[model samples]
Target chain A: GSKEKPKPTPDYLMQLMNDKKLMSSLPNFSGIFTHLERLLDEEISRVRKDMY
Target chain B: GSKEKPKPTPDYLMQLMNDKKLMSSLPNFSGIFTHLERLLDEEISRVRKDMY
Candidate 1:
């Protein structure tokens, strides 16, 4: 959502994915992110459609 | 990003905030979200400007 289309996975998001400690602590961390990613894409598409 | 304006803080995002274990494990969790919120707002503004 900058000048360009919003990134489905931003750096901050990826940081969470790569965080070893976090991943270890949260058993379902990846699953949550998987869902989050899906939601993110849907939201982006929705936003784009509305812009039109 | 539904037909509605994108929520600055969506339900899924709030889940992270409300997750007691997550909040306890990640001491900087709230800080990251704070920054994320700022970025999210900026991105939304940028997207709206582009749409205009």
Candidate 2:
């Protein structure tokens, strides 16, 4: 799967949300971001590895 | 400015770090990753692009 991966941390996601270029390019990015945040929270709990 | 884009999120970064192919191809990736982590913090502050 060559698909791009998801962001692992809140701080990192925040950074992306704050990036002007990225926001402009990705419409409804905040909503998409919110979805990603939820996914991360769920996936993190299931995985045994420590991401940070 | 056509360089491969930086992973905008830590989860994305972690994904890259954990990728077996990436680890095998890039030596000292753990150390390089630490440096990237610091850079992300600094550069993210100045960036005007929303990358989510």
Q: How do the predictions measure up, each by TM-score? A: 0.26, 0.19
**Scored by CA lDDT, what does every candidate get?**
0.42, 0.37
| Candidate 2 interface RMSD to the true structure | 14.9
Computed on C-alpha atoms, the DockQ of candidate 2 is 0.03
TM-scores of chain A, one for each prediction: 0.35, 0.30
Off by over 4 Å in 2: A1-32, A49-52, B1-52
Evaluated with TM-score, which candidate comes out highest? 1
Could you tell me the lDDT of residue A11 within candidate 1?
49
Which stretches of candidate 1 lie above 4 Å from their native place? Answer: A1-34, B1-52
Highest-lDDT candidate: 1
Window of ten residues with lowest summed lDDT in model 2 chain A: A39-48
Of the true interface contacts, the fraction found in model 1 is 0.00
Q: How well is each residue in B1-52 modelled by candidate 2, as lDDT tens digits?
A: 1223333565554443334343345466343332233333333332324335
- Candidate 1 lDDT over residue span A1-52, tens digit each: 3444444344434443434344446566555332233333444444345442
